[model samples]
Target chain A: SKPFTLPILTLGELTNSRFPLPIDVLYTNPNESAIVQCQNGRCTLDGELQGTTQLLPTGICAFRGKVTQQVQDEHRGTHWNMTVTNLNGTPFDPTEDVPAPLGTPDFSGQIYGVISQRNTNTVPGEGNLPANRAHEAVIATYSPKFTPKLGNIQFSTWETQDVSSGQPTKFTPVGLASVDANSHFDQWTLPSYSGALTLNMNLAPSVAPVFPGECLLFFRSFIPLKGGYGNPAIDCLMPQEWVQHLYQESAPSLSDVALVRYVNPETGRTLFEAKLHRNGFLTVARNSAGPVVAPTNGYFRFDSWVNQFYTLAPM
Target chain B: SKPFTLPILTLGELTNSRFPLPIDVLYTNPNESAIVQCQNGRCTLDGELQGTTQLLPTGICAFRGKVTQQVQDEHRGTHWNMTVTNLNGTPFDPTEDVPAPLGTPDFSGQIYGVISQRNTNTNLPANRAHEAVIATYSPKFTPKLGNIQFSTWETQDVSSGQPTKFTPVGLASVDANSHFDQWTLPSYSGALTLNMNLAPSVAPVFPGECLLFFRSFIPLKGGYGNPAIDCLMPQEWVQHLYQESAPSLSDVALVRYVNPETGRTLFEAKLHRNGFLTVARNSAGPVVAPTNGYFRFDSWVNQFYTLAPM
Candidate 1:
């Protein structure tokens, strides 16, 4: 089949709204335009090439005109009935081909992240309210999913004072903030196959005291695999903050106590209650009717303290 | 063949200072005492029971007596020569059947542990000095080996008020001093070939507060291959503690395999608060290698700053 030139009107002339707008509709390369007077009712074309440039039997046509307010109203936010519709002499139905959007599946399994705390207070002593007091800074930013060599494991880290402060947050460049390939903890993957991941953090050495405040070194039981910008999920709620605290040497004796409470985030009901007193003693009680079997006496570390709340099983 | 009895001397009679100690060495169940006067030269046992209770042709004899000072010198921490040796008219070589005890191989790789400070000052205002500081018991008794199972994984906590009140340390057998096997950080056998043995404990969770008690919470460098007692090998120590502080919130702050002397970070890591840290090669600089040096975690205020020394 031979390719033939189709007449095309200049955009400027096509947009003109004059009643009988005169325009040069061209069809050839080093073209000559035929004068056509286009109106709402009919078009008056004058030229020797008029009949030859008329619409062809197998050509497709498109309208070039302004859509008035009434026409737009009929089409605005409206679904087209296309049960047996024909598009360009072809059977087509938009409804059958396009599927409705379904939300992502919920990930109900264990995940890992490193937990730490920081003093966001600009003035240490002054304006140090409980809100400004010590809070757990749960960081899952650099959490590893799996070994990169084993799978297409993606990792990244972004920092900003805007997290606790109002400063605008920004992300570090892609490869810069990514976990190194050679790292020991580099073996991680998204949507972990084993449904488990380990988080790690180094405390400031005592000689240096780099991390001077109280430290509660621990890991969480469950975390969503993905959140925010397609990264590991992070929960920074202070209420959910759980870990074994390594109190400072001068920390008060009362501060050494351990408290375990389960609050139904959905409902306000307290499920269980337990606490280790300052005198190295602990007691347990449940919210339900059955007798609460007290846990045996033991030093209250972060791991032992939390084990009382859950049963042991393979992940 | 009738069962014959062998003469057995009482341990006390054998250790007596009398030369060639003359004693009633009896072997029969219930019978008259035999006149078996034994001496270094010979034993006169020409009696009626001699022929009845003679030594069996195939029986092996072992002296049942304490090794005196003279006998101790012959085998005191010394290897015995047994080539072409004959015992009871039979060829015997102790070396062929018993191999020398080769102690466990030395694990010299750099390890790490978390150290925390706790105030035990009773007089909060007056005697609140740096005396009652406590750190995590970071000790690695079962170094990483192949087949991540079968090793000493005895981890527990035993607390008491006497620690602060000068009472003796005691361990509670109940959940207080319990070993939670379901813990994510289970004892792991690294790249080791040894089997059927449990590691010993180097750290004790005190019934009373002990200031300098060692901790065996985690191991760095080589760790267990599996979550059980099996094989062991060097898989980067993920269970081991890294750093608590954000070395740098932006640039390379968290480091892995740091060189202590040169202060050069071999790799960068992402240290967080929830016991998770990730590491990667530093894009800013090439990883430098050291001819010799070991890794150590120095306890700063809040972070266990890693240092690799030459």
Candidate 2:
């Protein structure tokens, strides 16, 4: 006798001609938890993605269509960055609908690094042989908290680079020069300046530039600043309100970091230095009046935000 | 004068209350060119906004809200930025609707930058010496556009940062030794190196550390990865379609000037050093997706574009 078990229902019992359990019920929610695992050689999500887990063979399907091509890029010694787009709008306005199970929604995509003798060193206190930095690229659906009148603000897919060497401690002077002529005249005539202009011209040629090849890294928040009929619903994930709120609360006592240095690439005399204690507004309110606000009929509104930059130095 | 003229009835005479003429004849059509002039400094219908020849004392209204105290640490120089949020939402949606007009809608609020004499001998550039970047913050009413949802999107606020300074060129490390180290392992052993493997490091030091005081002028793209809500719209007068199209368009290549060093700041350094570009697919046949089709419900789905950061 077969092990006692409940009988499975027949396909006929599952559906009728009149209607099927809303084909959607069988569809998986793209936002649900899904694992993107890679093995010894390599694996990718660039293949045909079906629902949350069903990894169907790379072929054509109704929702995703032909599944013609896939592409992947990863740092030679580091991480894998990936993005996917162009799914047929099957569920109609799937992005506009929050819970619709229509397409692949971006969440977490990661990669691993390999260890080899080339990256290892036996010398004591000399540190392990330098390994190349890893990088990650991602493109996910983003909805901001503040609804933009113009269109949906798209973020450039994130491509993160690992540190290449000893943490960069100094920012090299990309270039530095002083105006020997009337450069400050325009600023001097403005009415906002009530106090005496302070001019400290002590050029410290001895000062070092940030450091060779030391460059600044940044993240950009893309939101429509001009008017148009774009994405009406705000990108909630973009966090426009959070940034605006933070800036509003942190206006007073703002400090700025300035880099000062002298460099003669030809002489190989690179000077790098930084000043962090200066007091002033690190973030300020944008001017939003006059002619910009005079028009009431046009849908020419844009998302407003605050930008903050972070710098690091040797401890 | 002599012909027994029936009491010549003027428009006033036609609407004597007993038989009032419809007001439609004298009123302007919302989308008509004739009505465009009335919104001169209010709501412009013409794609381009034109200031009124006769300056009105109460052309636009402005409000002053201090930037949150938290912004000081992240930004430098003037920590003030404004929002024209009051005029961009429906009366029903409190999250966005404009606040009740603080004062007469016509009052103009101008923020002026102070000007001073050029002092080339000083660290401060003469153009920026005493002058403050002046901006006029104006207020206006906006109506809905198309079958799309309607909300207030402020236009017309102008800003001019006069003293164009150093422009940024590019950023990178000088040598391989300048990178950070995240992993540490013991000599060969039976145990796997996985445990010793670093998950990932969030922050690292930079190659460009300068004396704190002299670091006054550094370039920033507003946020990490050059992610910023384009704030220049009010200053530049961008169109609505352009705004809506921003999401589907990748902003990775976008950049701004930093003036002095002639150094350029990359929008996303990670993708640049690493040879990875985004790939998208359209499940919706061969049709070109709608504006912001990626965000739409049925236009397309993400497949997964892949690349390594070599």
iRMSD of prediction 1: 43.4
Chain A only: TM-score of every candidate?
0.17, 0.14
Misplaced by over 4 Å in model 2 are: A1-130, A134-315, B1-171, B174-310
Residue-wise C-alpha lDDT for candidate 2, range A158-187, written one tens digit per residue: 333332222211111111011223111111
Q: Could you give candidate 1's per-residue lDDT for residues B186-246 as a string of tens digits?
A: 2222223232222211111222111110011111112111111111100011101111222
Q: Write the per-residue lDDT of candidate 1 for residues A181-251, one digit (tens) a residue.
A: 32112211222211236321111111100122212211111111211111211111010001011111112
Give the number of the best model, judged by lDDT.
Answer: 1
Candidate 1 residues lying further than 4 Å off, grouped into runs, are: A1-250, A255-260, A264-269, A285-315, B1-251, B254-309
- TM-score for each of the candidates: 0.15, 0.14
For candidate 1, what is the lDDT?
A: 0.18
